[PDB]
Symmetry: D2
Subunit: 115 residues, 4 copies
């Protein structure tokens, strides 16, 4: 699988477990088509979203349901969700890890792209 | 003005100047209606996007055009843009400062909300 | 004043108020000499730590007392403090803004350096 | 091993490879005693720094040589090094992952503490 998402909780210093997310691919009509989805594991990671065959070049959006995560912890958050929008490019062999580091009023996201 | 956006460049250690952004508000039909737009100044700030009267309760999206920013500096970055989606004013009028800290393969965004 | 520190609280979405910090300068004998200290204001900023005359070339350390900040809010955080160590003015006088974004188990620090 | 350090490069979107770091433990005389050191692997990780037996409660400092990393890439950085200072606490079974996300003028560090 060429795409993995990892989510961390900066308040508790822990993986962010059971965080739902949806992945979309931009269609020719410039609308977001559902592509894959899941929830993070006990390690904060979501594996197996796609395959090398299906993950062709294009524009993808990962929508991470951060608001429901904070609400389940009784913490009022700022964002509705965290959005990660990027172009997958074929250049050479490539694997994508999208990391998201969550706080109630702040998040960071990083792409680690390796061969 | 109750909404201000500030953008910093973590590669240069500078304000991120001339960064375009578009603000949208979710309409009754669940579509994103264009609300305001502008570009950051020499201080990396964008002021005057809206007024207290116009900035009603709702769900807002700030789309920060980070890819164009990096490309003009010779850098091919990971993200298409940075999106900041949030409910505003649902406990009454507040002032919102949205900060974004940019690197080619990573960004963070923070909200400072004052009454 | 050529050195200012700004601290934000990523749990509350607020300036981090009353955050103590101590600034040191590396002496000729490689020890850290106390240089300046203070606490952030209601805006989360600490101004007036030094003057252009006193802020000579050197290696400086800003020790931000984050643990005391979190403990007063009922939180037991991971870090003892946030340290920011940098060479200043080695290409001539500059203005330095050090920003720190705080969460209980994570923080970021950014420098904005202007001429 | 109860302590692992992982370093990412936010400019290139890659593990930060061959990053040197030194770990210190605070001694009773309040000085920093060398404890362990190493360089990150091709995965940006440094494993095997210590053992459960040796990693007793106390105050530890991880000093990450970020300046040499950026200098090897021809990029002028702001910080002399990144410092992570924390208390190891025995509470229950615990493993510590210290993550550092590096940009030339900014870094973030996060602790992921798991059982």
């Amino acid at each position: 699988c060429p795409l993995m998402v990892k989510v961390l909780d900066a308040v508790r210093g822990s993986p962010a477990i059971n965080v739902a997310m949806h992945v979309f691919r931009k269609a020719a009509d410039d609308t977001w088509e559902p592509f894959a989805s899941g929830k993070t594991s006990e390690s904060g990671e979501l594996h197996g979203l796609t395959t090398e065959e299906e993950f062709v070049e294009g524009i993808y959006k990962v929508e991470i349901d951060t608001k429901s995560y904070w609400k389940a912890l009784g913490i009022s958050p700022f964002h509705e969700h965290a959005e990660v929008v990027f172009t997958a490019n074929d250049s050479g062999p490539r694997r994508y890890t999208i990391a998201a580091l969550l706080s109630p009023y702040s998040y960071s996201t990083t792409a680690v792209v390796t061969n």
